[model samples]
Every structure is written in structure tokens, then in C-alpha cells.
Target: MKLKSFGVFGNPIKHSKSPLIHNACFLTFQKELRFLGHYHPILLPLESHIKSEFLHLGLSGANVTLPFKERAFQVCDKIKGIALECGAVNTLVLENDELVGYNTDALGFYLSLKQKNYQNALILGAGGSAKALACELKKQGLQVSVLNRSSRGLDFFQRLGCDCFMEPPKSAFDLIINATSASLHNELPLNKEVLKGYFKEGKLAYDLAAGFLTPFLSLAKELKTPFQDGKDMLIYQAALSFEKFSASQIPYSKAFEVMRSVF
Candidate 1:
């Protein structure tokens, strides 16, 4: 039988491991599932409408990645949950030919950080993922700091009462998370020297850029700091997104295990 199509849409989409994550998520039910998950590029100039492709390709749903999360929010017929709270939509579900947008990234990060019990966090990059993580971090009772190279998104974070900075902070943070696109090119989002101090014992360094080690993570390794790639955050979020797409009961641990195996 031909599997149904569910896609992850982004430009430069080849690197997305979402397909691997989602397919493994449904391993227990693949025989029962109608859809086969895949990564799809929503090309420039004409094809960003998520539901448009949904109808054409018979997509059950699609996860929106970087550069398109905010754009996805604008196109949604409605938004709910923390997605609206953060103004960024990373998950889209097709319902009655209309699109419903949700932000699972927030819940995903919150779940991971809660395990660490960190009191304060510094998030690098103020983009869609940063906004989602910062808002959720605050809701979890952790003091939040956001660092961005651009002035544009910092205001949004400041309004959220985050201590926003243009550079790495002088103030101490028990946790530092890199949410920038710099990792796409194996680059560091902030100055190496500035972050050197934060990579000490007891501090946690997390990068949202998964798959390969970015220079940001390489530095953490060099310093012998406890560090994590986006693996947990990504899988947590993907598991939630899979739950939305399939509308089934999936244990977070089960999906997390499946995603970990794929990545």
C-alpha cells in the first residue's frame, strides 16, 4: 500500500531529519498509518502556502522549520496554545481544509530544561525558536535572558521581560542554549572568549543545532563542560508534533527513543 504523505517544509530542506524522526515515531503503527512522513522544500517566490501543498500533495500535516515559523503563523486560519503566546508556529495540522498552527517547541524545551532544574538560562538567538523557548522558560519559573545579534527581535523578547542582550552576558546563567542558524554552517553564534567562562563545571551548554557538532559545542567539549546537542529538544518537539499529526496516544519516551535511534 502507498503511504500517505506528511511533510516538513523549509528551504534548503535536505538536512532536516524530521522524516527519520517521524517515521520511526510511527513504527509501532506504520501498518496502521496511512501517511509516510517526508521532508519537503517550500520553494521561494510561489509556494510557501502550507495548506496549498497540503491539498495538492494530500499531506496530513507538516512541521515548519526556521525562517518559516513566523510566516507559518501568519497563514494559519487560527492559532492556539503557546504558539500564539510566542507568535511563532512550528507545527501545522490540517483540519477541515483550514490550517491550525501550534508551537510544540515551547513544550519540548520546557520538558528538557525541567529535568536540569536550572534557575536561570541564557538563550542565544532571538528568532522563532528562541522566542518559543524563552517564553516557555519564563512560564517554568526560570529567569530568562536572550542574546541576539540583531536588534529587530530583541524588542519582542524585552517585552516578554527577558533580559535581552546584544552580546553574551556578564551576569551568570546556569544554562546557555544556542538557538541561532549559525550552527547550520558549524559557526558560533557568540564570541568564543565571551562564552569561555560559561563553559565551566556545573553549567549546562545546549545547542539547538543537532546532527553535527557546531563550533559552539566544540568549545564546550574543549572546556569539558556538560553539553547537549538539539537532540533532546528536537525529539521532544517532534514527538509532540507527531502526536498532533496522528491524533493518537504516543508516550513521549517511546517517540523520544525512536527519534534518538534515527538521529
Candidate 2:
């Protein structure tokens, strides 16, 4: 039988391990599923055009990456749950010629953090991704706070009913998530002074910025805190997307092995 088709679409997608992760999940389920990665350089109207084309081609589903999740949400006919909560859609599926959007970031992030038993979270950044993560954490009944350079994103964070602070708090957080593009520019979002004693020993830190070990992860290491470089989150989210696309549950271990080989 021919496998269903699915993929991830975004610029700078060469670094994505989504294909590997999704394929591995298919293998675990003994299901035939063909997953690939497509790099689309277009943004705005052009990006929408490309996505519409993909939909017209009979794609079962596709994952939307950075700079396009919000736009994906706008293009979809129906959205629910986290997708609606975050106002973004990282996962898209076609049902009966109607496109639907979902936000799996929160569930993926929540599962990863819960697997490590980390409850308290401090998020650095106030963008769409950060908002999604915050929504997921809040839904899981975890205490989360947003620490950003400016208060402009406070409204977004507040809408989720989570605590938002322009500066780091005095208390230490169990997990610190760097959800900004600071790592891409080789810049640190938090000042050394502000981060004082914020990361407890053996606490976990996550940087949504993938590829190399980011400055935030470096700081986590220096602080003797356990950390992840967003690879796990990527794979975890990919697993969720695969499950949604294939209409089956996917094992994480199998998908993770494939993801590791990609890097």
C-alpha cells in the first residue's frame, strides 16, 4: 500500500530533522508513511500561495515552521484548542478538502518537561512560540512566568492568565526556556545579574533555538543545570504532527533515534 504523504515547510529548513522523526514514528507503528522536508523561501502572500498549492496537490498534512505558523492559522478554515489559544498553527491537516490547524508545541513541550518532572518554568521571550509554550504550561497546571526585555508582550502572556515580568524574578525557576531569536544573533536575552541564582542546581533549561548549542544552553551548563538544545522539542513536536497526520500514535524512542541520525 502507498503511504500517506506529509512534510514540514519553512525557510532555513535544511536543519530540520522532522522527516527523520516522522519516518521513525511510521516505522515503529509498522505503517507506511512518507514524510519529507520542503523549504519554502516565500513569506506573506507568496508563502500562502505555496501552501495553497501544496494543499491542492492532495497532501495529507504538513507542519508549519517559524515565521509562518501565525499565517498558517489565518489560512486554515477551522482551528481549535491550542491553535486557537496561541493564535498560531504549527501543524496543519486536510480533512474532506477543508484545512485545519493545530498547535502541538504546547503538548510536545509539556510532555518533554513532564517526562523530566520539571514543573516551574520561566520563559524568556514574548513571541508566538513563547505564547504557545506558555499556554501549554498553564494548561498543565504548571506555574510559568514570562521574562522579556520589554513589557509589550505582557498582554499576550496575560491573556493566557500566566504571570508576566519584564525582568527576572528573585526566585529560582525549575526550568528556563529561551524562546527568542537571541541565540541566532549570538546574544543573551538575560543579563548575568538578573540570572543570579535563577537556575537551581540540576534544574533543566530549554532553548527553542535549535542546531548548535545556544548561548542559553551554555549558560545552563555553566550553572550546572541540565539542558536541552531544542532538538528534543523539535522531534517531540514532529512526533505529534506525525500522529495527527497518520491518525495513529507514535513512539518517541523510535522517532528520537531517527532524529539523532539526521544531525
Candidate 3:
């Protein structure tokens, strides 16, 4: 039998490390998997197109990112676990001719935070990734608050019984997560003035923007806060996606080592 194919789909996907991370995991496990990363621009209702294309190609699965998680949710025949919890889908698998969607992003984010011993968290976006992280945090008994520029983007978090704020809080948060594309634009979303006073002592700042450390991390450094970039989350989530594609859990330590060596 031919090796099963999987990929990550998004616009502006040239920067994504998912291909490297997933391929590393498969190689580490010696699994018969052939994964590739494809850049599918969100020009149309691309979720429907992706489902159709995957089915036609007889693909095993694919991972969704950025602008398509909600659309993936809408297109999938069934969703379960973290995907359902976040009201989004990041991992899609075709089971018995039925397309099923799952949100491994949440699991990966949750595992990363737990490994870092972070509890309370404040997320700085209401996009798909933020939703997945917040929902997963809530499930893990962590306090989560969302700070977005507009109230329109936060209804989903509010509906999930998590606090939402249109503005930054007066007190320092234990953890602050930057899930926006501001970093990719060479901008930082959290105001330094507000964060100077409110960033809690011993707080850990994190950005989910991947690759180089973002301005958000720079701000965290200036504020003397401990921080990490999204590379860890990216690797963890990609490993989870590999598990979905192969139907087996690969040891994360092995995968992380391989990712580090590759990157």
C-alpha cells in the first residue's frame, strides 16, 4: 500500500513549520506516512474545496490553521473532543468515508502550558487559535480571560463561560498569550504602558506566531518576564496531527528532539 499523505493548509503557508514537525514525528516513529505542507489560499469557501480535494486524492488527513478552522468545523461530517470544545477544528481525518474533525491544537497548547507549569492565562485574540487554547485551558481547570479589540470577536468565549474583556485588565495576569498576527506584521498587540503595570511577577508570556521571536516576546523580555515563542506549540500540535494520521501516539520527547535538530 502507498504511504498515507497528510498536510497543513493555510494561506501564506510558506512560513509554516508543520511540514517539518510532522515529517520528523513520522520519521521518529518509522511510520509509513508521507506528509507534505500545502499552501491553499482562502480565496473561496476553501474548506469545502479542501474536503472535496482530499476525498478525491484519497488522503488520510490534513491539519487546518488560521482562517479555516471554523470552515473546517462546518464542512466536517463529525467533530469530537477538543474540536467540539473550541467550536473549531484543526485536524481532519477521513474515517470510513466520513470526514471527522478534531482540534489537536488545544491538546498541544494545553500540554505545552502544563509542561511550563502555567495556570491562569490571558489570551490576546479571539481568533480560532485563541478559542482553541481558551477552551482547552478551561477544561484543564485553568482560569482564562480574553482581551480583544472588539466585543464582536468574543461572543464564543463568553458563551463558554470564560471572561471576556474589550480592554486590558488592571491587574497583572499570570500568563499572557498573544495569538494574533500582529507579530507577523512587526507589531505588538499588548500596550507596553498597560503591561508595565499589570504583567504579574513571575508571569510567562507566550506568542503563537511561530518562527522567530515576535515583538510580543520582545515586550515580554523588556518587562523582565519569562517567555517562549510558538515553536513548542507548533511541534506539539504537529505531533498530535501525526498521531491522528497514523492512529498512534509517538513519544513527544523523541519528536521534540527531532524537531530541534531539523529546525
Candidate 4:
């Protein structure tokens, strides 16, 4: 039998928990979904003929990650949904042999953020994730702020009406997000003094890696600040991917329980 193909595309994706969650989701509902799902990671340096490459490798659907999410949207022949507005695509579906992109990250992130009930948020780093989060935060009527070390991608965030900053924010935020890869290198996106000044009790510190306590969240711990890890985001996003992969539904409750237990 030819298995339906699904995978994640990104660089340094060796640590992806998406496959773990997705494959496990398949175990419970595979026969019902009617497609045997197989997941892989698409390690890449711009596979020429992006659409054809996935077909050659048997990708019917895929998740885009990190720096590649924006590029992945560019690869698609057209944008079907919020990827149309978010300008970042984290999910791809092959339609009539043409790639179509959508922003499931927005779905996942919105679900995760609403649990906090914050009025304003500060997302660090101006990348695909930042774009998606800011878009959702704006839609939800929260004041959104963005900070990046450099100016790249700031223009897009600014156009979204996000309070863009090249330096650390001077005011308090209900949510302080580490959306960059700075934690992977043990680097700080802002000066320790800036982090020191901004952090306080009841503020939420959200990191992207669910499996590990990131250095940024470690600081949150040091300050006794409330925090969240990417694990929740990881599972929700994967569940969204699974839904797209099967063109069907799996209870978010069922999917969340299965994925969280594995970690």
C-alpha cells in the first residue's frame, strides 16, 4: 500500500517532536483515517523545483518550521488561507499537483495564547514564528510588540501595526516570548539588565522548545515568573497537521493526551 506522506521541513530539525506526536496520533486513528501515515524530516538547502522534490520523495502534505516557514509559502503556487495574510506558512497541502500553503501555526498559537488571557505581548525575534504570533495576537485584540536584534523582517511586523523595537522594550508586557533561536546558542536576545528589568511575577515566559527548559525560560524560573514551553505549541501544531494530513478530525483532547504523554 502507498502510505500518505507527511513530514516537517526545516534546518537543524533533528530535535523535532512533531514526528513523534504525529506518528503516535496515527496509531490511534489510522484505520479510521484510511491512510497509513508516515512522517519524516525534510532537511534542506532549497531543493530545486520545491514542489516536484516533495513528489519525488512522496510528500502529500508537510509542516514548515522556523526560518523555512516563510520560504515554504513562497514555494507554494498559491496561498489558500491565513497564510495569505500572515505571510508565513507552516502547513502545505498538494492540490491538483500544485502546492498550497496555510498557516496552521496561527491556529496552534491562538489556542495556546488564549489560555493566558494577556492584554499585551512582546515577541522577540522577527521571523516566521514572530509573524504568525503577532498576527494572531493582533486579531485577538491584544496590543502586540515585536523586538529583534537587527532590522530584518521588522518591516513586515511593523506593517501589521505591531509596536516594533530594535532594542528591548521599555514597558512591561503580560507575555514575553522568545521566538528566536537565541536559546539554542546560550545567547540572550536582550541584555541581562533588560531582561532583569522587564521580568516580573505573573508575566508569562513562553519558549519554543517544549522538550527542554530554554535559557530564556531558565531566567524566568530564576525570577519566579510564570512560564510555558513549546511542547504545548508543538502538540497542537502537530494535531493541526494531522487533521490536514487526513482531511479529517481527531479530537484535540485525544491528540493532546497522546502527544504529551510521550514526552
Candidate 5:
């Protein structure tokens, strides 16, 4: 019995380029596969029970995004590595009749920033992406601070020893990241007054919204701060997710090559 269907699970998933990247790799590397080796972007309800929905969808594996990563963690029978430490799960696979979760986003995001020499980092938003990045940056010894509109989700960041704030920190950070869905809605993560000061000429700004120039990136541009969208991170994580989906039959290098071409 070969079950090879897969998808990315999220609310407002239409903007996702994941299917393109994954399918490109599938077509290139798994061309001989007779089964459904295609990848899709599945728009799920916000209140979905991941375990039930994933099983009902008949998927072999799926990547959870945005508002569902934490929920994905809750549904996994086994959680490993960064996903376990960050309390979020971006990638999921089924094996031996059990659901396993991993946070490929953490390492993927780190790989995107590995060449940079940022000493101070400020992350905007308190969702799963923020959690994953906070965990990764903190582990890498950067001073990570998190600011969210509401205090509801700060507990996890607090537990990770990240300085949590309801408002922007007074000091400027060398790296400022918009990890929120604000860009998805064409909104800025922080007010211009609060967000501007952080984007000094030499500072780096990153928005985790890929494909297009988000308002966050535009602001960074106006402020003359070196900035980039999340395309690289997307490709990196997609390759990582592809590795898990293929059970390592296709390695990251091979997957990354085909996936990166979609850009």
C-alpha cells in the first residue's frame, strides 16, 4: 500500500507557494511514482482538529502553517527536535500508524540567516512562527525579544527566556523580523512610529511573508534598511519538508535544487 498524497494545512493558505515548490521536486525526482505524489495547499478551518482532518484528508504527510502549527504539535503522536522545543510543528509525517511532527521552519529560517552576523533580534508576533524563530535565535545565542499586540501568546516566549513585550522595545535591534500574518493582509506588523526606528540604515529587516513585497518590507525599503522577504526561508523549509514527505528517499540537496527553480 503506497500512500503518497500530501498538502500544506493552514487558514488563508491560498498565498502559499509550497505546492509549487514541492510538486516541482516531486515531478523532477519522483516522476516515476504511480501514486498521488502531488502536493497541495489545503485551506482548513481555523478551529480544525489537525489529527482528525489530516486522517480524513487521506494525506501521507502535511506541513502546518500559521495559526495551526501549535495545534499541529498537539495532534502529533511523536514530536521531535526543534518542534518539541519550540512547541510548534510545521512538518508532519505518518509512520508505523503514528503521526510524527517536526519544525523544519526553525532550521530553515536559521539557514536563511546563517550568513548574517546579527547580534540583537526583535521578532514581531507571538504565533508559532515567532515561537520557532525565538527558540532558534535564542539557542544560537542572539538576544531575542518578542513583541505582540496581545499578551495572550507571550507565555511560551517567556518560558523560552525571550524578553516579551506588549509594545516595541526601547532599544534598536540589528535584526527586526515580522513573523506575523499582518503582511498577508497587507498590514504592517507595527505602527510606523514604532517600527521605523528599528530600521536604521545598517540594520536588517526580514518579513516571513514570501512571493511579494509585503508592507513590512516596503517600510524597510523606505527606511533604507537591507530587507528581504521569506522566499529563501520558504524554499529551505519546503526542501526540508520534502525530505520528510519522501522519507529521505530524496535528500535536501536534490529537493532544494528543483524547489528553488520555482522562484
Candidate 6:
């Protein structure tokens, strides 16, 4: 029997935990599903064609990340779920040889929050991840805002009725989320002093770059504010994507538990 394959698409993909989490699920359920497959990281350059590259590699399903999620959404033959609402794609499945896009990031992050009492949110970075989170947060009736260095990415949030800020925000937020790659490089998304005021008692600092103490999270620690890395979000989203890749042969709860064991 031919083996199926899956992978993640991103520029700085080496740091991705998707392969570790998904492979755990695949291994645990391989016998039950009677299929052979593995997951890997496919490091893609900024200018590469996402769809063409995906087809060339013969991936059964792929998870999109970082700067490419929006591009992934554009290349999809069909969009499903929150992806359609958020205008971003983080998970892709090929059905009838057509690439269908889905956004698990929003739901995944929502589950990761653990405590959902936040009334206002400030997402740092207006890229695809920001869009996904903003969509979910807004649906929950939070006053969502976005801060980006450029106006290009802010238009989408503006259309979503989110307060867009090109400069440091004047107001405080109960949830400050880092949706950018700034954490991966040990950098903060904005001026340290400017971000310092956003965190306090009863607020949470969340970084989308997982698996380590990103500089953004470090600031939260220094300020004695509660904080969380992207680990839970990553695991949750990967489990959802794995269920899609398995054609629902693997249940979402089972996949989530198997993946969670890795951490």
C-alpha cells in the first residue's frame, strides 16, 4: 500500500511542533486506521508558490503558518469553517485533488485561552493569525484591536470593525497577544516601554510563537503578569488538522490526547 504524507508550510518552520504532535497521533492510531503516513516540516522561502509547491511534494494535507496563511487562503479551491469568516487558511486538505482550506487557529487559540473572561484584546501584528484570533474574539463580543507597523494588513481588521492602530495604543487591553514572528527571533513586537503598560493584574500575555520563552512572554514575567506560550494552541490546532488529514478516521479528542502526551 502507498503511504500518505503530511507537512507544514512556513519560512522558519524548523521551530514548528506540528510534526512532533501530528506524528504522535499518526503513530498511535496507525494500526486502527490501517494507514501509513508521516508529518514533516517544509521550510518555504517567502517568494515560493505555496500551491505549486504543495502539489509538487504530494502532501495529503498541509498546515500553513506565519506569513503564508493568507496566501494559502487565496490558493484554496474551497474554504471551510472559520477560515471563510477570517479570510485566512492554516490547514489544507486535498479532496478530489482540490486543495480545500480551513482555519483551525481561531478555534485552537480560543481553546488555549483557558479563561475566557477577557473583555478587550490587543493583537500585535495584523497578519493571518491576528485575523483569525480577532474574528474569534469579536464573535465572543470582545472589543478587539490590532496594532501593526504598516497599514497593509490593518485593512482586514478594520473591515472586521476592529480598532486598528499603526502606532502605540493609548488604551490598555486585558489580553495582549503576540501574533507576529517577533518572538521567534527573541524580539518584542513593539517598543518595550510601550508594551510594558499593557499588562497588569487580571490580564494575560499570549504569544503565538510556541515552545519557548519568547521575549514577549519574558516581559510579561518581568511585570508579574500571567502569561502563556503558544504550546496549547499549537497542539490543539495540529490535532484538528490531523483529524482532517485522516478523513475523520481519527477522532479529534483521541488525537488531542495523543498529541498532548508529547508535552
Candidate that would win on lDDT: 6
Per-residue lDDT of model 3, residues 194-248, tens digit only: 7665554637888998778788888788878888888778877776776666655
Tens-place lDDT digits, model 2, residues 100-182: 88888877776666455566788888766887888888877779888887776777688888888755677778878889878
1-263, model 4: which lDDT tens digit per residue? 44788888877778787887888887767877776787888776654444666677868888888668778777788897678778788888887777888787777877776465788988888778888888888888889988887778877888888988767767888888888988778777677778867777337888876778788888888999888888778778777767667665666666777777875
Question: How would you order the candidates by TM-score, starting with the best?
Answer: 6, 5, 4, 1, 3, 2
Q: Which residue pairs overlap in candidate 3's backbone? A: 172-198
Cα misplacement distance, residue 42 of candidate 1 (Å)? 5.4
What is the C-alpha lDDT profile of model 6 across 1-263, one tens digit per residue?
45788899998878778888888887788887788778999999899998998899998899999889999989889998889879899999999989999998988998888886889999988779989999999999999988888778766898888998777778878899999878777789989888887875338999987778888898999999999998899888888888888888887788999888886
* Tens digit per residue, CA lDDT, model 1, 1-263: 55656777776577778887787666655655554455444543235566566567777678888877877887888897889878799998877777899899998887665465789999888678988988888887889988787797866788788988776677778888898988886688877778887777338889887768889989999999888888778888998888787765556666777777777
Tell me the lDDT of candidate 2. Answer: 0.71
Please report, in order, the local distance difference test score of every candidate based on alpha carbons: 0.78, 0.71, 0.74, 0.78, 0.85, 0.87
Q: Which consecutive 10 residues in model 1 have the weakest lDDT in total?
A: 37-46
Among residues 3 or more apart in sequence or in different chains, the pairs in candidate 6 whose N, CA or C atoms overlap within 3 Å are: none
TM-score per candidate, in order?
A: 0.87, 0.79, 0.85, 0.92, 0.94, 0.96
User: How much is the lDDT of residue 206 in candidate 1?
Assistant: 90
Which segments of candidate 6 are over 4 A away from where they belong?
Answer: none
Backbone clash tally (model 2): 0
Candidate 1 deviant stretches above 4 angstroms? 1-3, 31-47, 249-254
lDDT of 4 at 137: 86
Q: Report the error of model 6 at residue 234, Å.
A: 0.5
| Model 3, global lDDT | 0.74
Pitting candidate 1 against candidate 6, the one with the higher TM-score is 6
Clashes of each: 1, 0, 1, 1, 0, 0
Question: What local lDDT score does residue 107 receive in model 5, on the 0 to 100 scale?
Answer: 87
